[PDB]
Structure 1
Amino acid sequence: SLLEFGKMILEETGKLAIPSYSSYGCYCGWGGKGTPKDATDRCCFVHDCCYGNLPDCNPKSDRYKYKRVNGAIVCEKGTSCENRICECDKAAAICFRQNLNTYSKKYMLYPDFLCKGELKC
């Protein structure tokens, strides 16, 4: 679920999901179109695509379970949707962590009109 994903992001990066990753670039918090602005935004594009692989799951509300194994995120067995949603969120959180070195506050609250065209998953 959104809140869990937010906590996972905080644990991983030390940044609050909202507002650090809720309105970032073209795809974080509201993706849809355009070329991702940077690596972090690309994390969101892929996460969007990942959720898109699950048209009959409900990532915003469905809660999954995960544990920490010496820092590593391990998605624990739930329903198929929960397992897949967890792996999507896990990837995004790790991707955010791996790209903190280029994260730019200038992309927070990025305007929609600067995101043009469709980029295929």
Structure 2
Amino acid sequence: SLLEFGKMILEETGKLAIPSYSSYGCYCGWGGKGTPKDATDRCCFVHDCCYGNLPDCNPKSDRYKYKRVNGAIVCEKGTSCENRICECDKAAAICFRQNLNTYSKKYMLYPDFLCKGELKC
């Protein structure tokens, strides 16, 4: 759930997921449309697509477990859903870190009306 994912985000970026990545661009929040603003925003886009391909699950609420081994996130072994949700989160957390380089403050608190158009996964 948001609890584990947020821990990963902090671990990988040194930033608190909320409010750093909770109102960022067009896809780092609840919104779901328009062209991602930058690399960080695309990370959220991909994350939505991953969760979007877990129909048989409950991404935001299902609690899962994981641990770090040699500095790299390692998803433990839970139910099918737990491992898949954990992987989706891991990929995003790492994506955020890889692109901290281009994280822009100007995309924080981004107005949703500035995002229009469906971008298929």
User: Could you tell me the TM-score, scaled by structure 1's length?
Assistant: 0.97
Residue aligning to 1:82: 82
Query: Is the partner of 2:94 in helix, strand or coil?
Result: helix
Residue aligning to 2:14: 14
The answer to whether the Cα contact below 8 Å between 1:31 and 1:48 also exists between their aligned partners in 2 is no
Aligned pairs for 1:29-48 (under 5 A) are 29-48=29-48
Computed over aligned residues only, the root mean square deviation of the Cα atoms, in angstroms, reads 0.7
Question: Alpha-carbon deviations, 1:55-111, whole Å to 9, x = none?
Answer: 121111111111101111111110010010000000000000000000011101101
Moved over 3 A (4+): none
The answer to whether the Cα contact below 8 Å between 2:44 and 2:92 also exists between their aligned partners in 1 is yes
The answer to whether the Cα contact below 8 Å between 1:28 and 1:44 also exists between their aligned partners in 2 is yes
1:3 to partner: Cα distance: 1.1
1:54 to partner: Cα distance: 0.6
The answer to whether the Cα contact below 8 Å between 1:33 and 1:117 also exists between their aligned partners in 2 is yes
User: Could you tell me the TM-score, scaled by structure 2's length?
Assistant: 0.97
CA distance in 1, matches of 2:95, 2:31: 16
Residue aligning to 2:101: 101
Q: Percent identity?
A: 100
User: What is the number of residues matched between the two proteins?
Assistant: 121
The answer to whether the Cα contact below 8 Å between 2:31 and 2:112 also exists between their aligned partners in 1 is no
CA distance in 2, matches of 1:90, 1:21: 15
CA distance in 1, matches of 2:59, 2:31: 15
Query: Is the partner of 2:68 in helix, strand or coil?
Result: strand
The answer to whether the Cα contact below 8 Å between 2:40 and 2:96 also exists between their aligned partners in 1 is yes
The answer to whether the Cα contact below 8 Å between 1:31 and 1:45 also exists between their aligned partners in 2 is no
Query: Is the partner of 1:81 in helix, strand or coil?
Result: helix
